[PDB]
Every structure is written in C-alpha cells, then in structure tokens.
Amino acid sequence: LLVEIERFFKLHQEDQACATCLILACSTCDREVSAWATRAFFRYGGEAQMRFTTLP
Amino acid sequence: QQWLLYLSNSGYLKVLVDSLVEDDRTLQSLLTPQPPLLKALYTYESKMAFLTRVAKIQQGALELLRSGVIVRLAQCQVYDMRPETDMFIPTPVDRYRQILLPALQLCQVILTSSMAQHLQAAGQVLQFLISHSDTIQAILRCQDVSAGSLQELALLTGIISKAALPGILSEL
Amino acid sequence: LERVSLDAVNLALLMALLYCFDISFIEQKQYIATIHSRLQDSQLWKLPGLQATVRLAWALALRGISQLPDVTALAEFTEADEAMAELAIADNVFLFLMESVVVSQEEFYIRRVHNLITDFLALMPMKVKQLRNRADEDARMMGNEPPISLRRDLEHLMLLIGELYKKNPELALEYWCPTVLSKFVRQMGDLLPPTIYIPYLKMLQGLANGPQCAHYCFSLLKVNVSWEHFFHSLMLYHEHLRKDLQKEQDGLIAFLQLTSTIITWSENARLALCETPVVVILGLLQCSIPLKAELLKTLAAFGKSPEIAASLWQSLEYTILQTVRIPSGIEVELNEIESRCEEYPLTRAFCQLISTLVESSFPSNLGAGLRPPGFDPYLQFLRDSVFRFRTRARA
Secondary structure, X not given: OOOXXXXXXXXXXXHHHHHHHHXXXXXXXXXXXXXXXXXXXXXXXXXXXXXOOOOO | OHHHHHHHHHHHHHHHHHHHHHHHHHHHHOOOOOOOHHHHHHHHHHHHHHHHHHHOOHHHHHHHHHOOHXXXXXXXXXXXXXXXXXXXXXXXXXXXXXXXXXXHHHHHHHHHHOOXXXXXXXXXXXHHHHHOOXXXXXXXXXXXXXXXXXXXXXXXXXXXXXXXXXXXXXXX | OOOOOOOOOHHHHHHHHHHHHHOOOOOOOHHHHXXXXXXXXXXXXXXXXXXXXXXXXXXXXXXXXXXXXXHHHHOOHHHHHHHHHHHHHXXXXXXXXXXXXXXXXXXXXXXXXHHHHHHHHHHOHHHHHHHHHHHHHHOOOOOOHHHHHHOOHHHHHHHHHXXXXXXXXXOOHHHHOOOOHHHHHHHHHHOOOHHHHHHHHHHHHHHOOOHHHHHHHHHHHHOOOOHHHHHHHHHHHHHHHHHHOOHHHHHHHHHHHHHHHHHHOOOOHHHHHHOOHHHHHHHHHHOXXXXXXXXXXXXXXXXXXXXXXXXXXXXXXXXXXXXXXXXXXXXXXXXXXXXXXXXXXXXXXXXXXXXXHHOOOOOOOOOOOOOOOOOHHHHHHHHHHOOOOOOOOOO
C-alpha cells in the first residue's frame, strides 16, 4: 500500500496506519523509497487528503 | 617497482606535467638559448624520455594521466597549431616535428598502457585526436630527415588511432 | 552571374545551374572535359565565392559522370578531383551553400537543390571523411569564435541540411525512408567532436518535421546514440555545472532544441520520452543556466493531457517553493517566484509550462506541507507579469 495507504487506513484505522508507518520507517534492509514514504505518511499523512491531527 | 610508488607521488608528477607546458615555450626559447642548449638537450630530452618510460607501465601511466597530461599538452599548444606555418627552414621543421614525435609517443603510451577500450583512457585519447585533427591528416604526406621525423609522427598517430576506439571507428 | 556577393538575386540562377550540372551527359564529352580543365585553372578566384560553389558543385556531379570509364580511366582522381574540390572547400564552397540554403519557381529550386544536396552525400563521402578527420585534429586543447569557425566546414554542411530540409516534410522523409542518406545519418551520428555532435543534433531536428518524420526520429534514437545517452549527457553537464560552483551552451542548447522538436510532434510516444528526460530536465532547471527557459519549453512539450500531470506540478512547485521563506504575506509568495524566475527567458518558459499544465487540471492541496496550499499564488505572480507588460522594452 505504500504508494495508496487509504485502503489500509480504511480497514485498519488511522492510528494503526501511523503505527505501522512508524515501524516501516524504522524497519531495517528497507528501500529508501519505502522508509521515506512511510516517514512522510507518519509525519505529514496524505497531502490534501488525510490530515494528521489533534482535535478538540 | 619501486619507484612507481615513491616517486609518484611526489614529486615528480606534478612538476613534470607543468614542465610540459613550459616545454612548448622552451622549444621557442630554443632558439636562444641554442646555446644554453647544450644544457638543456642533455636535460629536456632526458625529461621526455623519463615521461615516456613512466607511461610504458600501467602504474606510471596512471600517475602521469592523473597529473593532467592532456591538459598540460593543451596548454603547451604544441599540437593545436600547424608547424609549417612558422635558421634554415628544414632545420626548424625537423626540430619542431621532433618535439611532436616524442610527445605523441607519450600520449600513445599513456593511452595503451591503461585499458584502451571502454576505459576512460580511450575517451581521453579520442578527444586528443579529434581536437588536434587535421594535423594528423596533414602529417600523412611528404619528405626529408624531416620526412623521417614526419614518418615517425605519422606512425605514432596511427597507433593512437587504432589503439583508441578506432578514431575512424568513432567517426562513424 | 559573377558580375553580380551578397546579391540575393543569385538565387534565381541556381535552379538553372544546379540542373545543368546534373545533366552533364547532355553536353557531349569534349565539352565537359574542357570545362573541368578550365575550372581547375579558375581556382585563382577567392573573391568570387559563388563561382567557387558552382564549380565545386560541378565536381560533385562530374565524379558521377566519369562513371562511364572512357572518361574516368583518363583522369587521375587525386589531381583531377580531390585536389580541386579540397581547394574549393578551403575557398568557402561549403559556406556559400549554407548561405544559399539558409536564405531560402520553388519547385525547380527545391528539386534541383535537393538533388545537389544528395549528390554530395553519395558521390562525395571521401571529402566528408577528409574534412572530418582534418577538423578533429586541427584545434588544440584562447579560441575565438573566428578560430572555431574557420575549420567548421563539416558542421556547415550539416547546417546546410538543416536549413534546406526544415519544414519540407516531402524531402526530409528521404533520409528516413530507406535504411545512402540513412547511411549518412548513421555516419554523422558517429562524429563525436562536440561541435559536430551539436550540429548533428540540430540537423536531425530539422529532419523530425512531419508527425511521420518525428516518429522515425523517435525510433532512430530508440532503436537502430540513444535517448538515454542524451539525457545522460544532460545529467552529466548538470553535475559538472553545480559541482563547479560557451561550448557547453552550444551543446546543451542543441540538445534541448532537438528534444523539443520531437516531443512536440509526437503522440503516446510523448509519455515514453517523458519516462527518460523528465527527471533530468527538472534537475537541470534547478541550476542557474542562461537555458532555463529552454528546458521549461521542453518540459511543457512532455506534459501529457491526462491525470498524470502530478509529477510535473510537484516539480514546479518544489522547484519557487524550495528556497523561499513564506510568512503568513502574499508578497512573500510572489517573491518566491520572482527570486527564481529572474530573467525574461525564464519567465516566458515558465508561462509556456504553466499554460500547458493549467490546461485542464492539477493536484489537490498543492504545496501541502511547505506552504499555504492551492493554485492561487501562481495567479498572483502573473500580477508581477501582466500588470509591467505594458512597460515592456520590444513589441
């Protein structure tokens, strides 16, 4: 799903997606693309799509 | 052996390449100094020989090339000109062509002495030929002791040609 | 005709003269032989360039005529042809062709000239090689433009082609249609000297003219120098440029001119070139370069009609956004564009790219992360432009 992670998001939920995203980023032997993308998702979520946030 | 490593480094290379540039200038200054010539023929020729010898082996050729041989040669501008353009004239032609034969041998030797093919050396030599083309062509026909020097120069270019990607082959 | 150098009127006579030499057989060949001899004598005249051309042309033809061996056996090639032709080249016989070609009864002229142009390929190859080899060796590693141009006879020939063939696709097709020209092109492709290489790129651009020709040019690089090599060259130059922080401008400008010409006249193929020059071209744009505008023009050609605009928009936003610091106001945003798009060419290129991308679509929440998102700041930038326009230089 790295390229579309909405599907993961939908089924699993946002929190879980974030957690997995963190693991992929940290995960060792991974391609830079994967780690960077996961880092990007973790940090910024999906641009103009899913936003990453504290809500009152 | 031994030397290649030591010598390399230092010193010599740097100094000797710079001295190539100055070699061109030194051939002109050559007329004057015909006299101070005696000194220097004993030395300048010896320098060319030293350079040629280093080129004959793999490690030596690498050091010369690293020193930026092609650059100094471009700077000397020995090749990027026509000798005929311009003492009894046949003597000056013999002398100038003479310088050209040794430098050309040094270039050919450096080229072949690496892996002349896909290697970087092949590319550098081709640039040498194309940039100094028409001299190669011009060299091909005529005579005298001057012819003898001319003949040797012609062979040297031919060796450079085939040794590289065939200068002709490249010029498809 | 001699008692004309500049006078354009000379062109009117070229049809008759080109065709006349073409039909040398008609003459006798006691007469043809006499002309040949007279011409060699006539090498006295450097001032008349156009005499030099026409004579050179006659030679290109004569060689073919000598095919009936009665004539050929009689003559010695070195003395009879090569020496004279070489003299003519030295006396700027190619230069004036280039002039005839550049400064383009059209049918008679085009037909007769294209016959001339082709005759030179097939019959002449010895001369081409002689010149090419001559050129490679001549220069030595402060060259003035005049010094660069002196020996440039081969490149001039390539330009001759470029001007004559340009538009005209009809003529251009001849090159591509069968796999000697096709040989010529392969041959030209081989010439490595940076200047020959750049003119080769330009000549091909001219050849690329029809939607049909463009397709062949696409295949020429792709299948039977490859497109990849081309981008590689661009990539290498990019590194050298940045690591460092005229010759290159010549080469690069030509590289871009060519990519532009084909990408414009192409179809599904556009995506293929797009993915590949797109990434490299983007990188080149980041560098200052004089050139910026030109790559933008090429990029635009690459831009596809559909959804897959996104890579391009990101490049553009990233390539305005990156340096700029944007406060939370509007002006800072304008500044981002102004800083990057410093010169006139840069802007015109930018406008062409933008015109293309804006044609029908872009990504949502563009610029997300870095800045206040959305397309709006780009339009603001135009305030900088068409506000200013009134005060151009230069209509």
